[PDB]
Design an enzyme around this catalytic site. Structure first.
Site, PDB file in Angstrom:
ATOM      1  N   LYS A 219     -85.943  -8.625 -16.050  1.00 34.11           N
ATOM      2  CA  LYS A 219     -84.751  -9.072 -16.759  1.00 34.11           C
ATOM      3  C   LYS A 219     -85.002 -10.486 -17.279  1.00 34.11           C
ATOM      4  O   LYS A 219     -85.160 -11.423 -16.500  1.00 34.11           O
ATOM      5  CB  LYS A 219     -83.569  -9.064 -15.789  1.00 34.11           C
ATOM      6  CG  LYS A 219     -82.182  -9.000 -16.405  1.00 34.11           C
ATOM      7  CD  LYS A 219     -81.139  -9.139 -15.303  1.00 34.11           C
ATOM      8  CE  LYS A 219     -79.721  -9.123 -15.829  1.00 34.11           C
ATOM      9  NZ  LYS A 219     -78.770  -9.567 -14.773  1.00 34.11           N
TER      10      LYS A 219
ATOM     11  N   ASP B  84     -66.981  -6.372 -10.061  1.00 34.00           N
ATOM     12  CA  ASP B  84     -67.357  -5.906 -11.399  1.00 34.00           C
ATOM     13  C   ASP B  84     -68.012  -4.518 -11.379  1.00 34.00           C
ATOM     14  O   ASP B  84     -69.112  -4.326 -11.898  1.00 34.00           O
ATOM     15  CB  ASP B  84     -68.301  -6.916 -12.058  1.00 34.00           C
ATOM     16  CG  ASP B  84     -68.496  -6.660 -13.544  1.00 34.00           C
ATOM     17  OD1 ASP B  84     -67.521  -6.268 -14.222  1.00 34.00           O
ATOM     18  OD2 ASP B  84     -69.627  -6.862 -14.034  1.00 34.00           O
TER      19      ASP B  84
ATOM     20  N   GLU C 126     -71.646   0.646 -16.514  1.00 34.36           N
ATOM     21  CA  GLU C 126     -72.782  -0.067 -17.101  1.00 34.36           C
ATOM     22  C   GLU C 126     -73.612  -0.760 -16.018  1.00 34.36           C
ATOM     23  O   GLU C 126     -74.755  -1.152 -16.257  1.00 34.36           O
ATOM     24  CB  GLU C 126     -72.311  -1.092 -18.137  1.00 34.36           C
ATOM     25  CG  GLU C 126     -71.597  -0.483 -19.335  1.00 34.36           C
ATOM     26  CD  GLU C 126     -70.098  -0.729 -19.313  1.00 34.36           C
ATOM     27  OE1 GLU C 126     -69.691  -1.906 -19.421  1.00 34.36           O
ATOM     28  OE2 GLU C 126     -69.330   0.253 -19.189  1.00 34.36           O
ATOM     29  N   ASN C 127     -73.033  -0.898 -14.826  1.00 35.68           N
ATOM     30  CA  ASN C 127     -73.681  -1.589 -13.714  1.00 35.68           C
ATOM     31  C   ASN C 127     -74.151  -0.642 -12.616  1.00 35.68           C
ATOM     32  O   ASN C 127     -74.634  -1.083 -11.567  1.00 35.68           O
ATOM     33  CB  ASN C 127     -72.726  -2.613 -13.112  1.00 35.68           C
ATOM     34  CG  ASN C 127     -72.452  -3.765 -14.044  1.00 35.68           C
ATOM     35  OD1 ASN C 127     -73.273  -4.096 -14.898  1.00 35.68           O
ATOM     36  ND2 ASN C 127     -71.292  -4.387 -13.885  1.00 35.68           N
TER      37      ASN C 127
END
Lengths: 266, 265, 266, 266
Positions: free
Chosen positions: B37, B131, B135-136
Site C-alpha cells: 500500500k 468503519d 470496501e474494507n
C-alpha cells in the site's frame, strides 16, 4: 482543513446568476453532500479589482459559525475560474421572497429582523461589520430561517475606506456615502432600512437616481405609508438616525416591544 | 525488522484507494507474496490523517486473527510511505457484491459469522473498528472474510468527532450525532452489512448526505419482499437506535438464521 | 377510497409493540409512500371481543382530518390478521419522550396542551369524545408536533357505556370510573391529568393499586410538588374538578394566561 | 364509426400487464388486421373509480391523429371487463428499452425528445395536456418511432383538479403535486425529466420515499453526473424550472442547438 477540486463535485441546476459569476447546486461525490458552487471568472474579478474583496469574503465567512450566517466551506481555483463552496439555502433569497409576496406581515418582518439581529450581534462580537446588508444577500434555510451571506464588503471595525461605491446606495448610511469614518453602527442603519422595506415593499429612500437617493439618505428624508403600525414606526425611526451614536444596540432592537410582540423566534 | 523498497519486486495494481494505490509485491529473499500500500506523504499531511495512519499501523500489526488482514510492517521513503500488508487473493467483498448484485443467505450468513468472530476478538482486546463497510472487507485464498483498514478504529469508549468525510451509510446514529459511542458501533454496522449483502444496497441509502442522515437518525428502513423472516429478525435486532438494545456478538453468532445458514461454525 | 392488500407493501422495522398487535414501518410499493402498518391478530381480537371498538376506530379516525390527529388511510383483512394503514409519526410517542426527559419544561408542556386542545376542539365539533387520552396515545410528527391516535375507545357524545375497563384508570375521570353518564368533558379531565404528568413525570392520582387510584380519582386527591408554578397549578386545578360542568371549555384552556405565556404555537 | 365484439378477434400472446388489466396481441378476423387488445376488469375499475378517466382516455385518444400518438380504434364492453382496441407497437415500450440499454446516447435521446415534442405540440394545439408523460407510457412503432399512449390522466387545459395522486411523483411538476392550477407547461416539465432519465438512467428527483421525492421536486433539487454534456445540461435546466412561465415552448425545444445537432428526425 481540506483540499478540493471540480472533479470532486457533481454540478446541478443554476440557483441564481449574480454579477461576477453564477451559483449552482452541487453534490460532494464521496459523501453525496448537497451544497452550492459559486463560480467566478478570474477575468471579471482581476479587471474589476475585487481580488482583495474576494479574499476578505473567504477569510471572514469561513471563520464564522452561526445558524443565521451562511457557511463557506472552502475554495479552489481553476486555471480560468475560482470556486467558492457554500452552504445551500433551499428557499432562495429574501429578495425573491419579497418579489413574490410584495410586502411582509409584521410577524415575518419581526422574525427576520430578530434572526438578522442575532447574526449581526455574533458578527460584531468577533468585530465584523457587514456594511452590505440588503435582501439580495439574505438567504433562507430549510426551515425558512434567515442566513446572511456575501461578506465581500465586510471589513474589521472601525474603518475609514472609501471603496468604489458601485451598487445602488439604498442600504448605505450617511456616514458611508459621505466617505467618512464608520463603525458597527452601519449595520443598524441597514437593519432599519431593511425592516422598512420588508414592511412596505420598497426601501425608505428609494428614488430614480443615485444623486437623489444620496440627498434623501443624507437628510434622512423618509415617510411611512398609513399601514405601517406605530410600533414599527418607532423601531424604524430609532434605527434611522443620522448620528450613529443615537442608534440603538442590537440588544435594544431584540428587546424592542414590537419585535418580541411579533417575532416567533425569541 | 527493518524494510526498504529495494527489498521488494512490485507487481500489478490491486486496487486504487484514495490516499494511494495497492500493488502486488514479493519479498525478494524469501519470494513471499504480499501487498504494498503506497501513500504519498503530501496527500496525507495536508489532509491531516497522519495520526490515523499511525493508529492503523499500531493496531493492525498487534492483532492476530484469521479473519483480520495482517499488517507486516511499514517504511517511509523521502516521498511516500509503504504499508506491507497481507495479500487477499480474491479481492474485496465490495467487488464481489458488484459482480453478484446480491448474496444468498448462506454466503451472507457465513460472512456475518466470520466478521462476528473478527469483531469479537477485536473487542476482547478493546478495539472498535467504526468503519465497517464492504470496501474494507477482503477475501482470503479460501474465500474467507478479512477485515482491513483500521485507520478509523480507536479504543473504546470514545467521544471524538472526526471530520466525517465519507458517506455515512454504515455509521450509527450515535456517531453521526457526534455523541459518545462504544463497541456497539460495529454491531450497527454489522446489521447494515447483513442487509446490504442480502439486498444489494444498504438500508439507509439515499441521494444526499443530509437525507441519509435523516434516515439513519430515525432508523427508517424497509425490507424488500425477498428478505426472509429470519434475516428480518437479525437485522432489526442489530439496527436499534439505542446501543444497549443491540445484541452481543455471541447472540449474533448464536442466532437461529445464522447457524441455520452459516457453513463455518 | 381504494382497496389494499399486504403485497402492496414493503414492511420495515418494528416501531412499537402494542398489546393487540405490533406496529411496523411500511412503504406503499408503487408510490414509495412511507407509512405504518398496525397488525392485529384476529384471534386476540375476537376472543377479547373488541371487534366493535376496532371498527369504531377505523370509522372515526378515517373521517377526521387535523394536523394534530393521526391519519388512518385505510384497512384490509388477511385470513389470519387485520391491517390498519396509518400515518407514520417519525418521533415516536410522547410516552417514550417523557421516559427520556423524566419531566417536561413549561414550554414543551404548554405547547403539547395547545396542539392537543386544538385536536380535541375539532373532535368535539364533529361530536367525538376520545375518552382515552394518555401519553401512550400521543405520537409526534416530523416537526415534533403532537398527534392524537388510537380512537378505539372514542364514542359519540353523550354516552352511558360502562365498558370492560382494562387499562389502568389514571387518566379516567370520576364520572367514567363510577360508570355514570359522561360527555365531552371527559377529555378536559384527561387534559388536566396530562398537563400535570407532563410537568411532574407522574399522573396526579398515581398509586400502587387500582382500587386506591379509584379512591384518589373519586375524591380528586392530588398534591403539587414545590416546583410546579402557580400558573400551572391554576390551569391544572381548573381542569381537575369533580363536576364536569365546572371544568373550562377548550377555548378557556387555549386562552389561559400560562398557556399563551409559554406555548410557542398559537 | 363501427361496432365491435370479442368474437371479432383472434387473441394472441400477452404484450404487457398494466395493473388495471393486461394487453394482448390481436387480429381482426375479417381483415386479418394486427392490433392490440387492452382488457380491463370492470370490478377493479369501478371500485377504484377511474370510470371517468377511462372514458376520458377513449374520447381524447380516439379523436387524435398523429404518427407519434398511439391510435385508439374503438372500444366495447363485455358483461365482465371492457376492451380497448389499440394500435400495436411492435417494439414495446421505451421503458423496457431503457431497462435493456441502461442509458441512451444523445442521438436516441435527442430524437425521442423531438418526436415526443411533435406529438405534444399537436396535443396542445387541440388543447390537450397529457400530465402523465413517463417512459412506461411511451411505445415504439415498427421503425423505432416514439408513440405516446395512455391519455387517462389527460385533461383540457388549464385545470385545477387534485386527482387522487397514486403512481409516483417522478415526472410530476411542482404545481401538480402542490395541488395547484396547472396548464400545458406540465408536459414541458415532464419532457425535461424524461430527457434527463433517457440520458442518465434515472429521473432527476428519484428517491427512496414519496415524501422525499416531493421535497426534491418542490425545491427542484437535481444534479448532473459528469457524463451529461453541456448542451443536454442546458436543455434540461431550461425545462426544469419551478415557474411554468419560465419553461420554453415546444418550438424552442425543437429548435434547441443540442436537439437539432443530435436528432436524426427533423
Amino acid at each position: 482543513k481540506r483540499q478540493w477540486a471540480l472533479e470532486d463535485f457533481e454540478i446541478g441546476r443554476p440557483l441564481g446568476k449574480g454579477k461576477f459569476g453564477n451559483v449552482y447546486l452541487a453534490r460532494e461525490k464521496q459523501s453525496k453532500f448537497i451544497l452550492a458552487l459559486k463560480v467566478l471568472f478570474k477575468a471579471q474579478l482581476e479587471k474589476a479589482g475585487v481580488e482583495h474583496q474576494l479574499r476578505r469574503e473567504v477569510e471572514i465567512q469561513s471563520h464564522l459559525r452561526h445558524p443565521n450566517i451562511l457557511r463557506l466551506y472552502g475554495y479552489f481555483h481553476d486555471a480560468t475560474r475560482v470556486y467558492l463552496i457554500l452552504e445551500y439555502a433551499p428557499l432562495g433569497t429574501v429578495y425573491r421572497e419579497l418579489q413574490k409576496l410584495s410586502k411582509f406581515d409584521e410577524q415575518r418582518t419581526a422574525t427576520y429582523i430578530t434572526e438578522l439581529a442575532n447574526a449581526l450581534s455574533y458578527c460584531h462580537s468577533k468585530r465584523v461589520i457587514h456594511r452590505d446588508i440588503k435582501p439580495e444577500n439574505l438567504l433562507l434555510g430549510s426551515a425558512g430561517e434567515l442566513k446572511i451571506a456575501d461578506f465581500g464588503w465586510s471589513v474589521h471595525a472601525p474603518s475609514s475606506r472609501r471603496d468604489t461605491l458601485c451598487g445602488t446606495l439604498d442600504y448605505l448610511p450617511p456616514e458611508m456615502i459621505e466617505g467618512r469614518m464608520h463603525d458597527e453602527k452601519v449595520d443598524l442603519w441597514s437593519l432599519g432600512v431593511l425592516c422598512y422595506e420588508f414592511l412596505v415593499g420598497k426601501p425608505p429612500f428609494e428614488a430614480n437616481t443615485y444623486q437623489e437617493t444620496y440627498k434623501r439618505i443624507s437628510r434622512v428624508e423618509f415617510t411611512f405609508p398609513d399601514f405601517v403600525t406605530e410600533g414599527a414606526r418607532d423601531l424604524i425611526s430609532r434605527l434611522l438616525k443620522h448620528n450613529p451614536s443615537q442608534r440603538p444596540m442590537l440588544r435594544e432592537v431584540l428587546e424592542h416591544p414590537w419585535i418580541t410582540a411579533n417575532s416567533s423566534k425569541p
